[PDB]
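Worked example 3. Consider a protein that binds cardiolipin.
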Amino acid sequence: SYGNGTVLMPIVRRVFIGALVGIYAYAATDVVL
Amino acid sequence: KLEGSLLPPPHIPGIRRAPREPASPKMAGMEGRMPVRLPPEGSRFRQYVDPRADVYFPLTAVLVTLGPLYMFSKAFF
Amino acid sequence: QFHREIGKLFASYSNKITANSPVQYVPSPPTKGKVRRALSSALMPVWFKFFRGPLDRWNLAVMAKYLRDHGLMYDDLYSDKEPVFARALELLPPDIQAARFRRLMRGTYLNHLRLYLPVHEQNYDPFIPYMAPYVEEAKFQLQEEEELLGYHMWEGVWYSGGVTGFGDKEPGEHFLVALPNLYGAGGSPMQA
Amino acid sequence: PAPEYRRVPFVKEDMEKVMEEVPEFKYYYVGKENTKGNVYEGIPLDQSILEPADLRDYVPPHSNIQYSKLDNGLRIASMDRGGLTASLGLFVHAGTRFEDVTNFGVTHMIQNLAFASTAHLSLLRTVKTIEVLGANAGCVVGREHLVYSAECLRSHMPLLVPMLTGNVLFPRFLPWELKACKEKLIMARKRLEHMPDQMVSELLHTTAWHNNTLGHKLHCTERSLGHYNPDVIRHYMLQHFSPENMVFVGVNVNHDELCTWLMRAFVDYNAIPPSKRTVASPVYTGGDVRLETPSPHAHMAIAFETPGGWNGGDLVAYSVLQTILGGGGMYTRLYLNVLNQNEWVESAMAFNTQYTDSGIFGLYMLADPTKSANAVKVMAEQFGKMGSVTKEELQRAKNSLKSSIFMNLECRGIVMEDVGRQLLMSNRVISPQEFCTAIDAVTEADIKRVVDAMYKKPPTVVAYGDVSTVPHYEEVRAALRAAGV
Amino acid sequence: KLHCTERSLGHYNPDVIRHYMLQHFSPENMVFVGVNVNHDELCTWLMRAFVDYNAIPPSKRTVASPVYTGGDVRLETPSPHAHMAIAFETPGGW
Ligand SMILES: CCCCCCCCCCCCCCCCCC(=O)OC[C@H](COP(=O)([O-])OCC(O)COP(=O)([O-])OC[C@@H](COC(=O)CCCCCCCCCCCCCCCCC)OC(=O)CCCCCCCCCCCCCCCCC)OC(=O)CCCCCCCCCCCCCCCCC
Ligand SMILES: CCCCCCCCCCCCCCCCCC(=O)OC[C@H](COP(=O)([O-])OCC(O)COP(=O)([O-])OC[C@@H](COC(=O)CCCCCCCCCCCCCCCCC)OC(=O)CCCCCCCCCCCCCCCCC)OC(=O)CCCCCCCCCCCCCCCCC
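Given these inputs, the predicted complex is written out as structure tokens:
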């Protein structure tokens, strides 16, 4: 938010989440679908 | 007289008072235990709650979680 | 002018939101779908009676016994490292601030000794929300500041004035601006 | 002969329909629809880019003042000159002359809390939205009036009206906002100390009207901080801020449109109710005061009382006398008789400060700190001859006064302040054409008459700067008495 | 006044000081006093302090008579009390 310089951790958060959604979606299509 | 931890408020000019719920009846199964309130009278939750089920919960919790996993594992894994 | 074309798409979606915005309070729409709200109501009498119901009741008993052993209120568990709660604490009147200070001191001492309070000192309701009026005013103040000043990613001079240049205002709080001086006796930002 | 006020009744309107009349306003620009860019690229400014559809036959606007009144008692007056920048002002009859020993400083507090949080708008959103609109706004405190004002493009008037009226309709006075304003409250008089002219004026008022009405100070003191809480403030506004004690003025606006939006600001909520108040008459005492300070000059001022003030019946005579002597020019009495005959005098002038029912008139000089005794002798000699003027001096003064009046009224700001200030002090606006007729009727006998009456009460003496050779109170009084004063 | 002011700093140089002492600090305008001392011994050591060097020479000065005027002065300041004083002149002094 306005007033602080914590500017990299919000980027790390969005990359980690996206990476998890892709790992567990690539495994289901191989086992289930 | 009143439900919960409230007492009749004194009348002090200048302080508007919110309405307070009156006491409701109790159910079986809470003797000797630290009191926790029941759902309100007009509510679907009150129609289904039963304090006697608290005693069996330590087992119910193990069965709903580890139960399905154990049977699913013993059949396909 | 490729930037002006992208700006036209943003603007079209923007004007659509505005043209469909109500001018008075309207209840939010249900989140869960009708298929999910039908299974829950059908299994409710059995799921609530034997599992969810006793889970809720055990939770409140566990919380109440731990707080009462230490003489604490639930709202004493929030930290002043939250910006919203820090602003709320600044708005308190003296009498409420003094009682919180005292309860926090006493609870640290009791946790150090690991000795329960007597039962007659535990006869109180710990779930009274004494911070609520100040929390809701704090949220209003900080939401205004963010909308009026923090709507864009602003540029700045890098590693100048004790800060990094990417948004921080208080100096020396990131490693690449650590160790401000090699000689001297230093100083405090609170004494500038 | 007061003006005839037209009635503007309250009307209940559908909210959704009134929103079709609010001017467009944007704080965010999420993309842009137009994609044509600068269509005048490459065209120099010696060439015109207008089309025939942009030409019109000029029609002059309505430049006379129009008058209206709401049902709650608010008086409204506006004039249109065809300009594109408007001036807006809200005048309140609640100055420092209404304070008491338990309130000193309250009017200054209200001025520094202007545009703070209200019932429907916060402090930050109020000052940030004015800036983004390109407007300027402020609040000024005085001895008889308080004024809120703003200037902006004339299409933004409906947006600025509520941000002006909210200060007197529903301010909140939040504790943490009062605690953030306490710093700037003391730095006022501190900044006043290093402004000699403003300090001499304050000393003149405090000494002329000892402990009453016009003698109260403008700004707060360290003592005032003992009663700087919301309850004291809110009690003062409930006695003085009723609609009957307020006037609204606009310049470069449509009269009918201004009335509609002012009516809409007051229709849904309750205003402070009226109250009957008795205005105490000022008590003039005169006296003497010194204030030593590091300075290379000796500042000195001597004044007398003007009976009746603005409504005494001789306002124009004192303004003609001021022009003869010389104000803030090279054929005035003070330039020829004083400055040219004394090289140790750095400056000299005459002043005339009038209020609703009292005023002062006198002289003000800077000089060499080693000749203060001679500065007093020259000032006394001028007072001794004030009641005598020649035909050439008088005729040249009238012509100079008429020109100044009409010329001052070419500016928007001065016109707004004059109209509002006159309607609070007299409930009527005197035109410049009526001033001229009165100026032309001033005679030599009138001058001599008002100077004599002026001298029937004691003087008011002030000294500031290096006062190492300034005579004693009794010696100044005696010098005046030897010159016939 | 007893103490200096910001104006006084305009003449705070050695020449002004030394000119003031040459008009007022002669031995004839000074007295020395001791308590719990031997008189004869004090005289001997005071004589020895002045015997080898030259003192400021005497000068005739005329003392101006004070002029009493009276009057009134106020000074506002943050305080819970109102201090007030009224006085008159005593002819001749000591
Ligand atoms: C000093 C006084 C005492 C006396 C004097 C002492 C003198 C000595 C002192 C030193 C003097 C010399 C100067 C040294 C300067 C060094 C640089 C420095 O200071 O930079 C600080 C600087 C912070 O600066 P700042 O001013 O505090 O704030 C910056 C912003 O203004 C504001 O940013 P922010 O606050 O918003 O966020 C900051 C945040 C930002 O956080 C991040 O961006 C995350 C960084 C860590 C990521 C990895 C952690 C694990 C995450 C999960 C796994 C992910 C896997 C990858 C896949 C991801 C999905 C795609 O950073 C941190 O949390 C700090 C972490 C510390 C990192 C230090 C590493 C330095 C380089 C050496 C690395 C060696 C690695 C060996 C081990 C591995 C060997 C195999 O840190 C960085 O930003 C650099 C990050 C580097 C990350 C390297 C990660 C390597 C490993 C990755 C995982 C690989 C796994 C593979 C497994 C394979 C198995 C087979
Ligand atoms: C010149 C020599 C030749 C080589 C030159 C190379 C290039 C140099 C210049 C590069 C560009 C510089 C300008 C950057 C943008 C500034 C924009 C601006 O004014 O906005 C201010 C803006 C603050 O805006 P705000 O709204 O007030 O606050 C934003 C909120 O915090 C959060 O707001 P939010 O939640 O809405 O999230 C916003 C987010 C929305 O976007 C997303 O979330 C999208 C996520 C995409 C994910 C997939 C792509 C991967 C993205 C990166 C993944 C993590 C990498 C972690 C790396 C750690 C180690 C470095 O936006 C972004 O992610 C945009 C930033 C993307 C740029 C990052 C990479 C380029 C810049 C790197 C730093 C510059 C060099 C410093 C050297 C210092 C040496 C002493 O500040 C930034 O965003 C700064 C970002 C850059 C990082 C800070 C510096 C880190 C220093 C430590 C590392 C030093 C390493 C040195 C050795 C290695 C070689 C370098």
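Take a moment to read the result before moving on. The two ends of chain B are 59 Å apart (CA to CA). Chains B and A do not touch (no CB pair under 8 Å).
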